[PDB]
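Thread: Modeling a multi-component assembly for a lab meeting

Hi all, long-time lurker, first post. My supervisor asked me to bring a structural picture of a complex we are working on to next week's group meeting, and I have zero experience with this. I have the sequence lines for every component (533 residues in total). Could someone generate the structure of the whole assembly? Inputs are pasted exactly as I received them:
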Amino acid sequence: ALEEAPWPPPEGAFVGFVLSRKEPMWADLLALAAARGGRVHRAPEPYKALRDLKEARGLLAKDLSVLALREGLGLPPGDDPMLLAYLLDPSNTTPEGVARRYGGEWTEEAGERAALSERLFANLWGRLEGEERLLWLYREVERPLSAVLAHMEATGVRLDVAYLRALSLEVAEEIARLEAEVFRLAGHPFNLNSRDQLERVLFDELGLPAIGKTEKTGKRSTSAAVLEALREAHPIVEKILQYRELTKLKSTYIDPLPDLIHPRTGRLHTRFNQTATATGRLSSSDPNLQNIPVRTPLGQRIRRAFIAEEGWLLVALDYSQIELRVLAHLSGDENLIRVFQEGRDIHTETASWMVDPLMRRAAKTINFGVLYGMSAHRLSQELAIPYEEAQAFIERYFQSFPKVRAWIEKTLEEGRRRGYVETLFGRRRYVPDLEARVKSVREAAERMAFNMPVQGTAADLMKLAMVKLFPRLEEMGARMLLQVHDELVLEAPKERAEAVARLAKEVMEGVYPLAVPLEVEVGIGEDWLSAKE
DNA sequence: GACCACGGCGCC
DNA sequence: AATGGCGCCGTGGTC
Ligand SMILES: [Mg+2]
Ligand SMILES: [Mg+2]
Ligand SMILES: [Mg+2]
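Re: Modeling a multi-component assembly
Sure thing. I ran the full set together rather than chain by chain. Output:
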């Protein structure tokens, strides 16, 4: 429909582009086009044409920006219809879906993608007419965040490859020791990576008791939860659990990651997906750097591989109990607020009449369990305690936090009536199953509905913090590298590391004052692990 | 080679 | 913390 016109397009044009593969740091830019004023302009030479653009404006704008940055061009992402649609309804996660829903078709041609971006923007922008709070999120959070994310993705993080290569060889030997032992105990070799073959050995051959079933197909489960309950029923179980941890870590982190170092940067580059979750959280992929191990000994060895550039240091910042602090704000519960106001540690309170680092991490679990409606039975089982004691603290927990219960009840009722729930800033998630006539389904929905305002507000705060923090770091010559939901990892020159850490901490803590203070813990170090002071 | 569903599990 | 939110592994299957 659009009149074909020579490259370049006029300022403000919407861009379309085709990548050889989804990851922009690795993609070949196959085609580039732009649409505006009833015309479409197709670039004869996509790479060179990139220099003609003032900004990347259109579907998946950030992806193009990342590729431009990769090529040394400071091309910032602007409007992206995906972000508008994601704010309207976070189930809007793909261009295929968004195009279908809001006025077009996602094809494989740059020109059509440019045209599509233009008309989708017009339509979506119109749908936002009147949605003042979603507009504010778009302008103050999502749109500027996309530029920040573009820089993070293009910067990447340094990884000690030789170290991981050496580690792989060690872990391989330990795994061989484990599988050889398991096979002896089974009385025959099988594929130990097959949970189906494992199922038969444990429950049919060795005749161990099958405890639970798998969700979709009803097989006898061999999950860690089950194996843990059998650890003293046969010596093969512990060996299997150790085999699981080692192969999990080797196959997911140790072996793959070193092979993903980019030839130009010498660094590892993730993608931070901005329209991928139902709550407003970011996600990370290709590879996921938001689930790097940290809990077990080997897991910590893996995390140590993430290092600062020579002459620089990593600065790691974490919000402390951001979700509970958020819950205190949203519910307005006086006591829970008094808890954070008076700089006390809540999990401690409960831990005493329940200081050990285990008698606390057990008090945290319970606190969150009752929070999510865990009954006196369902919780007394999961945790080594009688049903009585379960129902016991359940009643008091809410006796002392009455407004938390009332907030949950109010949130669900409104969710049922409106069809959606919302964060502090008005980000929405639609949850229709709050009215289902099947209890298990309805109650699953209720746990999602109630979680979203809390997890989503925490996400809103972190995103806003990232938006505020980025320009300050640029001025100081520091970089933002990673976000892990309630954590940030920065890279700073050694001489400036301490100042950067102080500043970033203050920016994060004061991003948007609540009824309770936000607290941030900060560490500095040569690697991701050591940086967690 | 690709895709899928699944069970399973890494992080927040 | 993992109840909630994700992404990736190998297996088993298909195309
Ligand atoms: Mg933490
Ligand atoms: Mg799954
Ligand atoms: Mg296969």
